[PDB]
UniProtKB/TrEMBL annotation, chain A:
<comment type="subunit">
    <text>Homodecamer; each decamer is made up of two conformers of VP2, called VP2A and VP2B. Interacts with a VP1-VP3 complex. Interacts with the intermediate capsid protein VP6. Interacts with NSP5. Interacts (via N-terminus) with NSP2.</text>
</comment>
<protein>
    <recommendedName>
        <fullName>Inner capsid protein VP2</fullName>
    </recommendedName>
</protein>
<comment type="similarity">
    <text>Belongs to the rotavirus VP2 family.</text>
</comment>
<comment type="function">
    <text>Inner capsid protein that self-assembles to form an icosahedral capsid with a T=2 symmetry, which consists of 120 copies of VP2, with channels at each of its five-fold vertices. This capsid constitutes the innermost concentric layer of the viral mature particle. It encapsidates the polymerase VP1, the capping enzyme VP3 and the genomic dsRNA, thereby defining the core.</text>
</comment>
Length: 50, 396, 396, 396, 397, 133
């Protein structure tokens, strides 16, 4: 139970993000109901991961 | 292929095991595997192709995990599981159909559809689990360079062929010495016919030989050998080799003599059976040589003595026949047989969606043309599509 | 049905797995399932009924649970398990036998014996677990109106019928034109005979047509087609249709001309094969139409020209054959086949206990009569008894 | 035997389930079983193969356990497992081959090879676990003397025999009354021939009887019964009983009359079918009594009336036939059949390593000679070697 | 196999590099590899050779590690290393010979000798290192079922065959039309002979065709095609197909006409060359079809016209040749070739110890028998013994 | 050319030497060369083909460096390395095929394919090592 719900519990935390994408191109800020404008990435598609 | 098989096996197990009232311990490992499958598939887009009339289909995975905390599965649990299972079954069936209708000449064993190539990525290797079916087990063993074999009840190893050879003939076709044969599927019916009944033969014996070169090696083959060929034991009007005229065949059946059945591998005799009928075992061979003799009966009762005069005209033609039925065998390669539906499934899917002819298989997946020219590229493509067809058969 | 199957599957698993010395971790889930079965059955009284000569039997369940506190199973554990297993196997055999010998026109799919109706109660659904057998899988699918599928090696789809039709006849029965056929099991042998050898037929062609209507739709069928029919290629004395007189048949086999095998679904041509014999695939059909022509050969050697004069008397009758063998097929309905034992088991149980004929099945469970008139009620009762027979054959 | 089977089954599971990326929960129980096997086999020396050309192989087991700590299996885990599995599979294959080539007149059921004798010790019983194969299940049931059951498709119960009996005959062989038959494998083709066409028989009926005594009792048998014996329906020149002369047989086939097929057990009628063709069920029998009749047609057309004169010479010989095929059956004893490969495996192994003829089996494992004289010692040795061959085919 | 190859590779590197006076920095990695080999092999018993006349040899390993404190190698260091190397080389030679003289019908690619079986265990996998030889590289690619490639100078792809076909003949054998060919090794010499010189042919053209089916597919093949066949250009007395009598062949060579080389794969045209002689490239094929015409020359000088009369007797028979030489090719299976010694080494070892005929290979390793019936089991066993032969050749040779 | 040869030779050395069970000291210099190649190639886009029937192929390098072990490489290490090696080998084969099918009357010794022209840039000279064939 804990292992299957770990990701959901961790992603619910307000004090850690799961990563950061450095894209030296100018990306529009997303419009999210929880923030207004936010530089939030839904996933990591299209970037090499370190 | 291992991943596609794992998906199908997971879905088949979920259908068979996620049932109302069952203890969770009966399904716990399966639920873990199912949730692993969901986790690995979530967030991925798939496209099953538009080849032929098979429609383009897009697949998305945003499914939740199945519960783990009940003592016994209930109706709600079964309904929730069934919703996800149906979508996964549809996706797997479409991937199997997309892979079954494609072929390649350079690398026919490698996946051909985009979905199966995507599923071969390392990110999906987590789905892989118990590979227990004969076809997937053979697939893994062959990827490991390991000796593996498919077991066939009545293997369709012989291309269909009904032909004759005339060793003695004339334009009027009335003193003919030769052989008639049907090789069909797992069955060989051969018959040597002499019109003069070996009246003027050395020692009054006429020798017949029939060689069948199998396109693949067979092992541990159970074979029935019967001393007559009912296919060539009744009067017939037969075309000539060019079809210019038609000749007459009027058999009278005698016991074949000096019957010697050799099963050979690389031109060497592996098994030899002399005057043995019933069950014989050909342990490992690529060729079957049947020698038999029409022996003129030294003594004849008047009714028999009439049928075989000293000279022409010959009205009753002395024929000696053998019948060889491969009941069971083992092959390194894949083959059609009387029990398995892989060929029928592949052909049906190719027919339903108007799949054009490719550079590998003959049109219509016709088995005679396929087995006649069983090239390595054809073998690779055919094992691939047969494994995919079995994987589809687990669910469809 | 799923509960009866679950009892049988648990008992088979216990027989196979609960062995001396085995790791308890090998059996933990099986032990939990077995103890759940014991708890559910404990305190319940069953009566397996006295239909026919089947003896009335009373079943009482007060059994202890199997232990859970070993590392490896020992002899004590195996013996304790085996006594209970023996009692349960006896009970399941008697329940299955009680159900197999029963039928009804109204709800033949529903349980008929009292014990199986009792086992359908919700207080037994906890016993239910992995439904992996083909018969139980199809049973669950059909309970949900889902696409079912049974795989048959040599399905017994054709009721036995050795008949002939004469399209040209007269009291002398010496200038006859027509067809004779044996449709038996998975084999159709048909043969069109012309006594005049189409001397006066338009274009010297005689067309023969043989339509066989399958009582259920077959899918993904692998079929062997052979040019000749060895069953109608030897001389016979055949009764007349009224049985008043016997006529004579003296075939000489010509190869059939323009052979056309059509596989049709609702009268629409699904598959068409022209002049192809080796091995074909009919993907979905319920009708087989065989068209084949006797073509008088334009050029003949003197013997052949002697066989076929311009006019009567005709002593050598030109026959063109055809053989059609369904090796493997898929049907949405249960069927007898050459490999399974459901029909034989049901018939054996009904015979051994002198079960009177009922409203649904013909006497002796005769397969020809059954499959000729395969009504929906007959299908329901047959699927029920065949699923019960498979459940029984898991243990007996 | 149970230990050898458990080793083989554990290895097959390990080959199929220990795959890269798989959840450890899919393999946990298998890993426990595998580690138990390693612990038990560690420190033990085995020797296999000193009979015929089977080479002497020495086996030493010093292997590490497989890990338990991973969440998904990775390449390292799979490689370590694969090395151990390869060694164990080689050992099991060699032990099976060593057992398959040995026989004993006294205790042929008991192990013969030294390795299987060592594995029968208590210190190996821990390896034992799920015994789910039909052959090992039958082995265990036979050990406890519970009713065993082997299901066969086309059982090879009839030793090959093509003979004839003449009830009326003369040196010229022109007025002959009698029977000729082929009893081969799973088929009985029997034909009664009267040259006078029962002109002088009482009531114009000639009675033919044929009794086949099966060497083992068959239960739940599915039988195809067809009216005609196509094997004895064409002109034939047959050696005389002493072989001093040949006689002529020009059959003309009439349908058999008053066909009565009885299936007998201990000389009592268990099943009986009167003029029934197609599929029939014989629930329990050791003898088949086929009684049929040539009934001279009371009414004939001129052709038919010409075939059968009032007195000699008789040029057309009235023959009635019967074909009986056992599609599927159940036997309490091991038998060869068309779908399995046990006999072929044992014969192939005995031929590849040049195993000298023993005191139990005929040379070459000739099935006709084996089933003709199927003695209890032969049965015990054959069940042993067939169980070993089924265990071997799980891996090899 | 990889372990045996790594042992041999380490020993060869040690023989080549552990030399007097060399900088220790030249051998540090090799010293580590050698010491890992010694550590892995120490305490292990091996037995090689119980087949034919190959003696039973027992091998025990209790060696010290080579030192690592020197900055340059001195004579004593090299001598102790050489002692260890000599023992190891003897052992590897014996293991290779033991593996080469064995064959299996079932898993011919797998090890057959007990020593190599033992070397297949996990504990020995530590020895494994650089697998750079062509044969071991192909071995590793074939284990993973990746596309293999063997480069052969003059591949021995044709079994020996010297025969003739007669299309027109009669018992006197004086008006013969047909073909004779020697297919041997990497060479096809073919010649079409018409005794009448196509006097009564349809337009004075006699078409000849020769089909050679290779038992393995060749890729990237450089092939020389020369118009004449010197092998069938001199007077011959040839047996008849039944051997009853003998016929005479008095050829006169004419240049072949409309020469067409076809290289085909699975009965499909891959390369076609028309009237091209010299070097040509067949990129991927398993069959060669050579079609060529004898064209009666319309104009003849008096000697030429006297050679070919209008009717019999024909004394000078018009023959057109072709010579085909595969110089180099690539095959996905092992093959004998002119430059390597794998077949010769395997045969030499098998003959030196009187290895009995086995169930896989011909009665003595005859290449004609092998290549004629080059079955997959034979291919697996041959690739195994050839890889072992190359490993042995790294040290013994 | 020297750079393309160096890429190919690095890949061949990686295939031959990065084998299960081998001492890390056997491959240390090779691993350093390979990781330097990864660093130099990562982030660069290449295009091959577009001549005759040679297909257009796009190559992107976003690979991680090969790790280090204490004593010996294991199976995990080999599979991880082989993924990168396989992609690079595909790329090098495609670049070679693109160069082999092109020709120029002027400057026929110079590179003709776009990928090799890019590989002649200064940034890729780091890849260059033993030119021994
Ligand atoms: Cl069958
Ligand atoms: Zn002819
Ligand atoms: Zn009538
Ligand atoms: Zn069958
Ligand atoms: Zn007699
Ligand atoms: Zn000649």
């Amino acid at each position: 139970l804990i292992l299957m719900n770990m990701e959901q519990i961790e992603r619910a935390s307000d004090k850690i993000a799961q990563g950061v994408i450095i894209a030296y191109r100018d990306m529009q800020l997303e419009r999210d109901e929880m923030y207004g404008y936010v530089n939030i990435a839904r996933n990591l598609d299209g970037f090499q991961q370190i | 292929m291992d991943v596609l098989y794992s998906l199908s096996k997971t879905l088949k197990d979920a259908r068979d095991k996620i049932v109302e009232g069952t203890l969770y311990s009966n399904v716990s490992d399966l639920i873990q595997q199912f949730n692993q499958m969901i986790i690995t598939m979530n967030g991925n887009e798939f496209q099953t192709g538009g080849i032929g009339n098979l429609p383009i289909r897009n697949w998305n995975f945003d499914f939740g995990l199945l519960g783990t905390t009940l003592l016994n599965l209930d109706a709600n649990y079964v309904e929730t599981a069934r919703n996800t299972i149906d979508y996964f079954v549809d996706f797997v069936d479409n991937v199997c159909m997309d892979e079954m209708v494609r072929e390649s000449q350079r690398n026919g064993i490698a996946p051909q559809s985009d979905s199966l190539r995507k599923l071969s990525g390392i990110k999906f290797k987590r789905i892989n689990f118990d590979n227990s079916s004969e076809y997937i087990e053979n697939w893994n063993l062959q990827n490991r360079r390991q000796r593996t074999g498919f077991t066939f009840h009545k293997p369709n190893i012989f291309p269909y062929s009904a032909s004759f050879t005339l060793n003695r003939s004339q334009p009027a076709h009335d003193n003919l010495m030769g052989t008639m044969w049907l090789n069909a599927g797992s069955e060989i019916q051969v018959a040597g016919f002499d019109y003069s009944c070996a009246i003027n033969a050395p020692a009054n014996i006429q020798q017949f030989e029939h060689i069948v070169q199998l396109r693949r090696v067979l092992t541990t083959a159970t074979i029935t050998l019967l001393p007559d060929a009912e296919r060539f034991s009744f009067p017939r009007v037969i075309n000539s080799a060019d079809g210019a005229t038609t000749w007459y065949f009027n058999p009278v059946i005698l016991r074949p003599n000096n019957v010697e059945v050799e099963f050979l591998l690389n031109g060497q005799i592996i098994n030899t059976y002399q005057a043995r009928f019933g069950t014989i075992i050909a342990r490992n061979f690529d060729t079957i040589r049947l020698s038999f003799q029409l022996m003129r009966p030294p003594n004849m009762t008047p009714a028999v003595a009439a049928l075989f005069p000293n000279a022409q005209p010959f009205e009753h033609h002395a024929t000696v026949g053998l019948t060889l039925r491969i009941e069971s065998a083992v092959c390194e390669s894949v083959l059609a047989d009387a029990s398995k539906t892989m060929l029928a499934n592949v052909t049906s899917v190719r027919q339903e969606y108007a799949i054009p002819v490719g550079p590998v298989f003959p049109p219509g997946m016709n088995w005679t043309d396929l087995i006649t020219n069983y090239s390595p590229s054809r073998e690779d493509n055919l094992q691939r599509v047969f494994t995919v067809a079995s994987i589809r058969s687990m669910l469809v």
